[PDB]
Write a protein that holds these residues in place. Structure first.
Motif, PDB file in Angstrom:
ATOM      1  N   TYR A  85      78.058  28.522  69.672  1.00 44.64           N
ATOM      2  CA  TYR A  85      76.932  29.434  69.837  1.00 44.64           C
ATOM      3  C   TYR A  85      77.130  30.352  71.033  1.00 44.64           C
ATOM      4  CZ  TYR A  85      74.612  27.202  66.028  1.00 44.64           C
ATOM      5  OH  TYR A  85      74.299  26.754  64.760  1.00 44.64           O
ATOM      6  N   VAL A  89      77.528  33.727  68.935  1.00 46.18           N
ATOM      7  CA  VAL A  89      76.143  33.986  68.539  1.00 46.18           C
ATOM      8  C   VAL A  89      75.352  34.729  69.614  1.00 46.18           C
ATOM      9  CG1 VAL A  89      73.944  32.976  67.817  1.00 46.18           C
ATOM     10  CG2 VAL A  89      76.139  31.982  67.032  1.00 46.18           C
ATOM     11  N   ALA A 135      74.489  31.939  61.746  1.00 48.13           N
ATOM     12  CA  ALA A 135      73.583  32.606  62.673  1.00 48.13           C
ATOM     13  C   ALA A 135      73.911  34.093  62.803  1.00 48.13           C
ATOM     14  CB  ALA A 135      73.622  31.916  64.037  1.00 48.13           C
ATOM     15  N   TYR A 139      71.591  37.262  61.813  1.00 51.07           N
ATOM     16  CA  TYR A 139      71.277  38.376  62.697  1.00 51.07           C
ATOM     17  C   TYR A 139      71.421  39.702  61.962  1.00 51.07           C
ATOM     18  CZ  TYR A 139      71.121  41.138  66.958  1.00 51.07           C
ATOM     19  OH  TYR A 139      70.797  42.053  67.927  1.00 51.07           O
TER      20      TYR A 139
ATOM     21  N   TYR B  84      66.905  28.822  69.530  1.00 47.23           N
ATOM     22  CA  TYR B  84      68.012  27.905  69.269  1.00 47.23           C
ATOM     23  C   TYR B  84      67.774  26.545  69.901  1.00 47.23           C
ATOM     24  CZ  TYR B  84      70.406  31.661  67.063  1.00 47.23           C
ATOM     25  OH  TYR B  84      70.751  32.645  66.159  1.00 47.23           O
ATOM     26  N   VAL B  88      67.505  24.581  66.495  1.00 48.01           N
ATOM     27  CA  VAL B  88      68.891  24.565  66.029  1.00 48.01           C
ATOM     28  C   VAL B  88      69.666  23.393  66.623  1.00 48.01           C
ATOM     29  CG1 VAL B  88      71.082  25.803  65.914  1.00 48.01           C
ATOM     30  CG2 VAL B  88      68.919  27.043  65.636  1.00 48.01           C
ATOM     31  N   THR B 130      67.190  34.163  62.733  1.00 45.28           N
ATOM     32  CA  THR B 130      68.583  33.788  62.942  1.00 45.28           C
ATOM     33  C   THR B 130      68.707  32.298  63.215  1.00 45.28           C
ATOM     34  OG1 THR B 130      68.707  34.138  65.342  1.00 45.28           O
ATOM     35  CG2 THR B 130      68.862  36.084  63.925  1.00 45.28           C
ATOM     36  N   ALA B 131      67.697  31.709  63.854  1.00 43.41           N
ATOM     37  CA  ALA B 131      67.725  30.272  64.115  1.00 43.41           C
ATOM     38  C   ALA B 131      67.518  29.488  62.827  1.00 43.41           C
ATOM     39  CB  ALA B 131      66.667  29.913  65.164  1.00 43.41           C
ATOM     40  N   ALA B 134      70.729  29.485  61.050  1.00 41.42           N
ATOM     41  CA  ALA B 134      71.637  28.469  61.564  1.00 41.42           C
ATOM     42  C   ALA B 134      71.331  27.107  60.955  1.00 41.42           C
ATOM     43  CB  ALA B 134      71.553  28.411  63.090  1.00 41.42           C
TER      44      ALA B 134
END
Ligand code: CL
Ligand code: CL
Ligand code: CL
Ligand code: CL
Lengths: 225, 224, 225, 224
Positions: A85, A89, A135, A139, B84, B88, B130-131, B134
């Motif tokens: 991440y 990310v 992820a 985005y 996150y 996440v 976006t989380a 994931a």
């Protein structure tokens, strides 16, 4: 003239992943490529890179991390997980957030993300990496339609089986075991060249692709079809 | 009951979809361990599992404020990280903690309450989307790995479902909300929390062993 | 130095749907475009067109039918249902099956299908049409990886909100409902011009896209994102 | 039972997933109308529904020889047409026939036994795949239209499931089959027909009203 004539392109981590082929293809098409080598895991670095770059027409978000091929879920420790991440990310949002103001001022811009087909379908033995590429894909999916209202394109290349040092380095692709696995799983039956990947990035960075918004384009020889 | 004799570990049981999960799963004979531990802390997941003992089903129930309306330019470093940190990183911590006993028995169930923002664009919810992506990726990548041990891992991609975090009673009464829903939800109504837990019940039960690494869209048709 | 220099392109139903911009864009890049106007709903017509055509490098499968906007499931009678399949589904297999032998002989070929975003997500009030477009998308999905073993690329353009007479005639664009969709459902907030769609087809027809296999590329201003 | 008091119209009840549907749905209290009518004939679907009377659930059970191994060049006109004639055109005929009574009652359930070949490339099954994609498109397009009337329409994208058409006893008994299956199926086994019917049961029950126009992949992880 060339297909990026007059354009200025900011390329992240320009020595890594797909940077070399991006410079080659984009410069042949008339672009001025700013080949940045800054570590964007540092908070605040992205705004400095953009301020030093000046006028930017295209951001190529080029990020990579060790996939840790074969590491299992139980072996995916806290540091391995966090590093995926931290590396691909969090810097993606930092650099995009840094470039979008000038794109919004001009009601025009282009962002191309070199991602992974592991963000589309199961890729065995690459757990933390896959989730981090998901992820990135998220985005693009979430920012794409938001930025499109300002005539900014954001798109994701979901690549696999493409020549690079991080995932398909020369020693790995030479073995018999790799070759048989590629023939089983890749319909086209070969790896892509780095140039072929940059030619898709060129299309997505050019003004020939303005109607493509928030999309994941699978660049994988048919692997995920 | 459909979960007779089963022990279910439920994370953040007072948040998100926790209450309906307890109600539906206990109705079907499950013993539900309603955990309230903060799994953003390293090490907490292993301690929760060791204290729980035998677990047949993990319900991974995580939520974070979506910050509806906050744009990309106002998504600052802390807002981004908090998404996150909250939904996440804890998901892998708790799944990694339960999988060992599933692997010894060659049997297990994991159900993740996710979001349809992991499937398609949801306006004004950037970091949150976006989380959730994931989390969807975690189910997609772990699912086929765990299935070799007869362990099912699946993702509920919910939207327009009653909960405090996203559809609290005040927000659903605005004029903009009702015709928003009418325009974009084919079924024309919110789901009850019970309806969501009935999908989780199917995915936690031994009626669903052939479902592996899947995202099931639970959204009244929104993403269709 | 055109991007289709030396290539011969067979274009179906060349005056309809996306044909005219395909001719203009592809010829500007050096292609010879065989602009066919044969009714391919007749069994046998596809092989006769391909035999007459001679050497073909690229097939552009350009098919359209009335979407019958607003016709409900109960009003979709046998004739309307069958006509969607007869017009854009069965001819697609006939013309591709006719072209593939010479592609297989040379271990090289390109097929670009102008499809519809209705093959990707729900599109209001176009039931029989949507299922026929799904069938076309399925044809690309199923044929793509099979043809890729012979170095033949087959890809699907899932377009929406794009200039054409069949779906964006002037009276539709003048409606309040279309204006509402452009305000709420199309992130980029405009129609594509046909040129732009043909530029995506150009990419997919060119030798810059050999790694793209059996994909559905969403060309919709962000609508399905 | 989970379908107590419900009447279920099952097409082609002898074929494909029909037998397991009868068994599971009758266990759950349903009256299953096990229809054997040839629905490739214009006019047949409306007579089937007229004879059946009150219907709560339609299980659209259609199958055709996939012609495993036949390439694009050998998929001739007859093979191609037969796929659409057998599983595509009859699907709209029977759904169109059942929807009027669903619309009067503002309630209904349609479950389509489809194929994972409607989701991802399945080698050597070209015409069959495209016809299954068309079925998936029917569910995708009709789902949100019917949901406006509180009718659920959903698609089971199955693969690697025991049935006479695709995974018959002689085919699945060989070591070559079992070896190839273990490589392509993360769960490493075939589904039973009953397991497929338990998914259809969920989608036919009133526990699944929020699921609209969806394709649920029932494939042991194959398409994940
Ligand atoms: Cl790669
Ligand atoms: Cl929700
Ligand atoms: Cl269009
Ligand atoms: Cl099957």
């Amino acid at each position: 003239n060339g297909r990026l004539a007059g354009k200025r392109v900011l390329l992240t981590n320009a020595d890594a992943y797909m940077g070399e082929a991006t410079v080659q293809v984009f410069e042949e098409e008339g672009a001025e490529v700013i080949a940045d080598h800054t570590d964007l895991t540092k908070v605040g670095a992205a705004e400095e890179v953009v301020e030093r770059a000046g006028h930017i027409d295209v951001l190529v978000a080029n990020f990579a991390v060790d996939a840790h091929f074969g590491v299992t879920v139980l072996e995916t420790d806290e540091e391995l997980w966090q590093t995926a991440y931290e590396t691909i990310v969090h810097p993606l949002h930092r650099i995009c957030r840094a470039v979008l103001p000038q794109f919004y001022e001009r009601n025009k811009g282009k962002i191309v993300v070199y991602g992974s087909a592991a963000a589309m379908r199961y890729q065995e033995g690459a757990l933390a990496y896959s989730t981090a590429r998901f992820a990135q894909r998220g985005y693009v999916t979430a920012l794409g339609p938001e930025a499109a209202r300002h005539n900014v394109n954001v798109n994701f290349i979901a690549q696999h089986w493409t020549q690079n040092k991080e995932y398909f380095w020369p020693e790995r692709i030479a073995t018999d075991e790799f070759k048989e696995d590629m023939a089983r799983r890749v319909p086209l039956g070969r790896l892509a060249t780095a140039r072929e990947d940059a030619l898709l990035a060129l299309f997505l960075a050019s003004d020939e692709s303005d109607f493509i918004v928030g999309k994941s384009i699978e660049f994988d020889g048919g692997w995920a079809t």
